[PDB]
Design an enzyme around this catalytic site. Structure first.
Site, PDB file in Angstrom:
ATOM      1  N   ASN A 147      -4.403   7.488   7.977  1.00  7.17           N
ATOM      2  CA  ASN A 147      -4.188   6.884   6.702  1.00  7.17           C
ATOM      3  C   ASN A 147      -2.709   6.912   6.242  1.00  7.17           C
ATOM      4  O   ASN A 147      -2.064   5.890   5.945  1.00  7.17           O
ATOM      5  CB  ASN A 147      -5.093   7.583   5.675  1.00  7.17           C
ATOM      6  CG  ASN A 147      -5.016   6.856   4.290  1.00  7.17           C
ATOM      7  OD1 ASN A 147      -3.984   6.913   3.662  1.00  7.17           O
ATOM      8  ND2 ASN A 147      -6.051   6.130   3.895  1.00  7.17           N
ATOM      9  N   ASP A 148      -2.135   8.096   6.234  1.00  5.62           N
ATOM     10  CA  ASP A 148      -0.726   8.285   5.872  1.00  5.62           C
ATOM     11  C   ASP A 148      -0.137   9.446   6.708  1.00  5.62           C
ATOM     12  O   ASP A 148      -0.907  10.275   7.286  1.00  5.62           O
ATOM     13  CB  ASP A 148      -0.595   8.568   4.361  1.00  5.62           C
ATOM     14  CG  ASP A 148       0.832   8.295   3.867  1.00  5.62           C
ATOM     15  OD1 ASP A 148       1.751   7.886   4.675  1.00  5.62           O
ATOM     16  OD2 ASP A 148       1.064   8.488   2.686  1.00  5.62           O
ATOM     17  N   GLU A 201       0.824  -1.255   0.000  1.00  8.77           N
ATOM     18  CA  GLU A 201       0.000   0.000   0.000  1.00  8.77           C
ATOM     19  C   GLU A 201       0.816   1.242   0.000  1.00  8.77           C
ATOM     20  O   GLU A 201       0.437   2.272  -0.595  1.00  8.77           O
ATOM     21  CB  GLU A 201      -0.981   0.053   1.178  1.00  8.77           C
ATOM     22  CG  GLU A 201      -2.121   1.054   0.940  1.00  8.77           C
ATOM     23  CD  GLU A 201      -1.809   2.492   1.285  1.00  8.77           C
ATOM     24  OE1 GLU A 201      -0.797   2.699   2.015  1.00  8.77           O
ATOM     25  OE2 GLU A 201      -2.606   3.429   0.889  1.00  8.77           O
ATOM     26  N   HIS A 235      -2.629  -0.336  12.325  1.00  7.32           N
ATOM     27  CA  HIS A 235      -4.002  -0.528  12.737  1.00  7.32           C
ATOM     28  C   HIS A 235      -4.096  -1.807  13.510  1.00  7.32           C
ATOM     29  O   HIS A 235      -4.528  -2.822  12.990  1.00  7.32           O
ATOM     30  CB  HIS A 235      -4.990  -0.498  11.553  1.00  7.32           C
ATOM     31  CG  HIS A 235      -4.964   0.801  10.783  1.00  7.32           C
ATOM     32  ND1 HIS A 235      -5.337   1.970  11.320  1.00  7.32           N
ATOM     33  CD2 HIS A 235      -4.511   1.093   9.490  1.00  7.32           C
ATOM     34  CE1 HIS A 235      -5.172   2.987  10.433  1.00  7.32           C
ATOM     35  NE2 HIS A 235      -4.663   2.450   9.299  1.00  7.32           N
ATOM     36  N   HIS A 249       0.197   0.461   7.290  1.00  6.66           N
ATOM     37  CA  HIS A 249      -0.599   1.201   6.253  1.00  6.66           C
ATOM     38  C   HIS A 249       0.372   2.263   5.686  1.00  6.66           C
ATOM     39  O   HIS A 249       1.433   1.912   5.164  1.00  6.66           O
ATOM     40  CB  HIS A 249      -1.770   1.867   6.953  1.00  6.66           C
ATOM     41  CG  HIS A 249      -2.864   2.410   6.041  1.00  6.66           C
ATOM     42  ND1 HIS A 249      -4.120   2.703   6.503  1.00  6.66           N
ATOM     43  CD2 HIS A 249      -2.889   2.704   4.642  1.00  6.66           C
ATOM     44  CE1 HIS A 249      -4.927   3.081   5.459  1.00  6.66           C
ATOM     45  NE2 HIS A 249      -4.178   3.100   4.330  1.00  6.66           N
ATOM     46  N   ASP A 281      -4.674   8.705  -4.364  1.00 10.40           N
ATOM     47  CA  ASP A 281      -4.452   7.918  -3.132  1.00 10.40           C
ATOM     48  C   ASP A 281      -3.128   8.447  -2.435  1.00 10.40           C
ATOM     49  O   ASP A 281      -3.205   9.495  -1.842  1.00 10.40           O
ATOM     50  CB  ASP A 281      -4.437   6.406  -3.410  1.00 10.40           C
ATOM     51  CG  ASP A 281      -4.692   5.539  -2.127  1.00 10.40           C
ATOM     52  OD1 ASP A 281      -5.553   4.615  -2.105  1.00 10.40           O
ATOM     53  OD2 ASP A 281      -3.982   5.704  -1.154  1.00 10.40           O
ATOM     54  N   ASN A 282      -1.950   7.796  -2.563  1.00 11.01           N
ATOM     55  CA  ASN A 282      -0.749   8.284  -1.925  1.00 11.01           C
ATOM     56  C   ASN A 282       0.076   9.159  -2.855  1.00 11.01           C
ATOM     57  O   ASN A 282       0.103   8.913  -4.086  1.00 11.01           O
ATOM     58  CB  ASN A 282       0.051   7.107  -1.413  1.00 11.01           C
ATOM     59  CG  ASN A 282      -0.644   6.406  -0.297  1.00 11.01           C
ATOM     60  OD1 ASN A 282      -1.554   6.976   0.333  1.00 11.01           O
ATOM     61  ND2 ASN A 282      -0.223   5.188   0.011  1.00 11.01           N
ATOM     62  N   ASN A 332      -6.096  11.364   2.518  1.00  8.68           N
ATOM     63  CA  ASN A 332      -5.535  10.048   2.242  1.00  8.68           C
ATOM     64  C   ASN A 332      -4.025  10.336   2.105  1.00  8.68           C
ATOM     65  O   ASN A 332      -3.341  10.534   3.123  1.00  8.68           O
ATOM     66  CB  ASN A 332      -6.170   9.498   0.886  1.00  8.68           C
ATOM     67  CG  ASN A 332      -5.818   8.054   0.645  1.00  8.68           C
ATOM     68  OD1 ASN A 332      -4.622   7.651   0.777  1.00  8.68           O
ATOM     69  ND2 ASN A 332      -6.812   7.239   0.352  1.00  8.68           N
TER      70      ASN A 332
END
Ligand code: LMT
Ligand code: BR
Ligand code: CA
Ligand code: CA
Ligand code: CL
Length: 328
Positions: free
Chosen positions: A141-142, A36, A107, A88, A242-243, A197
């Site tokens: 998330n990041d 991810e 998580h 993550h 996303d990233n 995100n």
């Protein structure tokens, strides 16, 4: 029911992918359960997180090798329970002494922490150092690291409980928010996102970039000497962003994206998600140059979330699938 029309646009449910090919793409052997997020050091060592929910791991590749192999980094220390390690987003920070810290969003069950490790190069191992948690980090998330225990973090949701997160997302509340965390000072720096995100920073530390997945936006914030962020620009796209990775030489952004949101949120092996990588140049100028560098419908790589470049190569990771390594 024009909560049908909001849903179609948010999840981009009509999108299909025009192919953009690169010469010479190879699947990374040994990555089958997600990759991810990833981050590449200036010397070409790449960290990759996987097995996001097949246990959780941090992988290492030496991108200076001609056909790089992945190895699993060993985690040592007694301050971390590995049996619930579920990594993550990640970020690295290289101190004045050249110590490398790796920050990993974790998580353990339905909760978030940020784990700080020291990378031990000679040993191919990660010395756990600290678990970070906080009420202003409900659903991380990041992060992007700005010291060994200093970072900006996205929360992709206001709630922690998965049932509530699901309601919160479908209601379209847009309560997700961004936190600055440091030992003396933890504050919300931006709020009102629909699924914040990816997040990253310009090489000179003056701009912060934040991906808002379900609005198809990247926000650019001026970052100030007191760590505060102020809105500067918003870029819009026809894809779920996303990233965000940043090339330290140019400042360019390399973004992993999900063209169609139905396929990444309601998985279906008969209709699996594709992959897309954007490059964004001159993000401050009046017309930022946005380029699709790689795009496919998932017959090779499914569900791209992240991409970075190193010396002519492009490495792409996914939420729950493989990784691809390509010549540009
Ligand atoms: C942002 O602020 C928050 O966002 C949404 C719209 O963005 C608001 O309104 C929201 O609630 C209702 C349910 O009661 C939803 O059916 C509606 O589609 C949604 O837009 C909230 O009142 C506000 O708390
Ligand atoms: Br797709
Ligand atoms: Ca990251
Ligand atoms: Ca992400
Ligand atoms: Cl909650």
């Amino acid at each position: 029911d024009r909560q049908k029309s909001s849903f179609q646009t948010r999840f981009n449910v009509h999108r299909e992918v025009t192919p953009v090919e690169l010469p010479n793409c190879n699947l990374v052997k040994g990555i089958d359960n997600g990759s991810e997020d990833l981050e590449i050091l200036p010397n070409g060592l790449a960290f990759i997180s996987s097995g996001l929910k097949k246990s959780g791991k941090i992988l290492l590749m030496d991108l200076n090798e001609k056909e790089p192999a992945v190895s699993e980094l060993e985690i040592i220390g007694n301050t971390l329970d590995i049996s619930s390690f579920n990594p993550h987003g990640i970020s690295t920070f290289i101190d004045d002494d050249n110590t490398v810290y790796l920050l990993v969003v974790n998580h353990p069950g339905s909760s978030s922490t940020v784990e700080v490790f020291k990378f031990q190069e000679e040993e191919k191992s990660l010395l756990h150092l600290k678990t970070i948690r906080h009420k202003l980090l409900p659903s991380v998330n990041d992060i992007v690291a700005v010291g060994p225990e200093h970072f900006y973090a996205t929360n992709d949701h206001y709630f922690i409980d998965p049932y509530l997160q699901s309601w919160e997302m479908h209601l379209g509340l847009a309560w997700s928010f961004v936190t600055y965390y440091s030992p003396n000072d933890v504050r919300v720096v931006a709020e009102g996102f629909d699924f914040a995100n990816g997040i990253n920073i310009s090489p000179d530390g003056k701009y912060v970039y934040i991906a808002e997945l379900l609005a198809h936006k990247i926000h650019v914030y001026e970052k100030h000497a007191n760590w505060t962020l102020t809105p500067l620009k918003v870029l819009s796209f026809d894809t779920l962003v996303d990233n965000i990775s940043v090339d330290p030489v140019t400042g360019d952004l390399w973004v992993g994206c999900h063209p169609n949101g139905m396929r990444i949120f309601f998985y279906d092996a008969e209709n699996p998600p594709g992959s897309e990588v954007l490059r964004i140049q001159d993000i401050l100028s009046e017309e930022p140059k946005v380029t699709v560098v790689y795009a496919e419908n998932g017959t090779v790589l499914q569900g791209s979330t992240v991409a970075a470049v190193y010396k002519g190569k492009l490495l792409i990771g996914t939420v729950f699938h493989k990784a691809l390594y390509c010549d540009l």
